[PDB]
Amino acid sequence: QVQLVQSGGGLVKPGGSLRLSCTASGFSFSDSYMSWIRQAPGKGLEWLTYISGSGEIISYADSVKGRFTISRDNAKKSVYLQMDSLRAEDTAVYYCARPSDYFETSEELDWGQGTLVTVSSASTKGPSVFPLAPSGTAALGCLVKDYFPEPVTVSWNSGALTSGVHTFPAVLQSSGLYSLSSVVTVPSSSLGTQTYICNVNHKPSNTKVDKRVEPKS
Amino acid sequence: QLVESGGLVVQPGGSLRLSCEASGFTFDDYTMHWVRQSPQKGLEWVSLIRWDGSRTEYADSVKGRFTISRDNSKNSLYLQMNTLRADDSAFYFCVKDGGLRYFDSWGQGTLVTVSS
Amino acid sequence: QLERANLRPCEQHLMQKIQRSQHQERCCNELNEFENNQRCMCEALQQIMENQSDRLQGRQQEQQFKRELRNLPQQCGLRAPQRCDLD
Amino acid sequence: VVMTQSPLSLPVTPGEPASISCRSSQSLLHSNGIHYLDWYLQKPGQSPQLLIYLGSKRASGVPDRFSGSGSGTDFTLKISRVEAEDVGVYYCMQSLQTFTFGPGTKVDIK
């Protein structure tokens, strides 16, 4: 019955500030420590801070000391994390955690659903879609380039082609925009007698593109 | 305030139920005891119930024949007395523990007569 | 090792802490024998709770005693156990 | 655990001091520091009321002229200057093993 309901987060510019909040039920909040933990994209867990039940004991990881501030309101059964002077490094999923018992050594046990915090000055932009043309079995694809924010979805022939498809995870470029490629491997024979199209969809910008991928002159 | 209900004449070997209505303090924070006062015999302690109702302890004299219970919803300490006996005849007091095993506030009293 | 301990000064120190030292010193000296040993430190705290359970006849006094008991290792310069049931 | 009292009857001169002794069959000292002894006054027509609890500490409504002392088995309730509303059966009670009241002392007005 322990419940940890997080709120806040979202998109923020570098140097800006966010206040993440987490409300707890199912245990004696005023006796329990509470902590915040994050996980940047594709990286490991990074412990950040905790706060005693009274609020008198507080600890910050070195990577965050001086920039974040943890607080709690036992009457509201809530714990807060004020993040100031944010940086691109801080982009991550942020987790609220409650420990297994009511001591200062008690290990994290129950976790909130996680909140995605993205620190970027970029603006919403739809992707540009360029083909990756063929030259046994052959390979072809479409390059989804320069879009923001995540995610984009990519199918082939509107879900009719699934086997041999590899849609790679997006990379963040020096421009602050993402890029990925989706490729499919198919027999050489079918090329001329089959039309291959990748259907790229980027909901935040309200963009849909269906570029054909045909061989070349 | 500790208004105390129940308590009538009963025959030997019978059953009776006592109630105690609470006023003036958070009932869900205090252990509650029953203590009885005999005509001839002194002040005898009866049973026990923690504020949560988790624990319940009983005097040896009236153990197994009496069962104690609290309804924190209705703020009432009950005492179900079974197998009443001439020795069980007495004034029954609803005692309010002080938090550290001392009888802070006593009721007014309700009499129980085991007689035929 | 657990059978040999004299935890009466811890019980004295805690109940005087609830009313509002000779025994805080003596209590920490006794608990010091269990430092950084979680299983054995827990049993000491549990045995303090066991002995004092009958004397805490009220919710507020019971929670304060538990709270002060959970803070007793930390306030003695020791690590508490990660998990220790006091019910 | 058995509780006894001396005197069984203590007629007092009002204004003068008074004492009652209580004694237990075994020591009333718990593993914590406390001596689990209370005192209870049952006046005529009224229920018992708390005078002194846990050996030395007195109750909220009980004025300062009620004192309580003792260590081990012997415990004494002293009164400084007796007054009007101080007459009845003075039971002592232990709270160590379970709850055992003494037979009580009658506070007559001599």
Add this chain to the structure above:
Amino acid sequence: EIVMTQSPSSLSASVGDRVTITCRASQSISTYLNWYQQKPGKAPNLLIYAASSLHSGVPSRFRGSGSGTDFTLTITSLQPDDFATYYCHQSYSAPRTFGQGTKLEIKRTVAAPSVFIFPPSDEQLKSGTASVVCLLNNFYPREAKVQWKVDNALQSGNSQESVTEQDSKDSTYSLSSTLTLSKADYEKHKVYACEVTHQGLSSPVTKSFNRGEC
């Protein structure tokens, strides 16, 4: 901060194997060492606390041991639900610290990648940037080298790799490497190639193109 050092960083093994993950602390942390499992998109699940104690509901195949600086998580017989990432975690002193993590992948037979190179589209060049993609398809193990050469000149710092997770059907990896240049820089050279090295290949493999071709 107490530094937690996990080994290995990655590990491949099969169902039924005996796996061992180690965690070494920067200083003595007594028995205050905890082990978590995390599957993608999910919050970690506690396996072990106090360096040896199983959390309720965790199957017996997980076992922890150690005291002081060196600790070990053992999985006696790996199960299908055990492929995930594992973290050690100290609560001895604050700030707490996780180990770097250990990803536990599925073992299988070596498989060479089929390599494919794609020149930048004409549509793209009209925008002023050129992306050259090298594709390695359906190989195993993950270990692979991808080297971009432009007119036999080694490129550095203008390429980005991207890999997929193990595939459900065949448990292989697929990787892409994308070399980004300006149209100006792109048109000052002729030959573009990516050299791929992988143990499943008898010799390194090179896929090349000449900027005007096909």
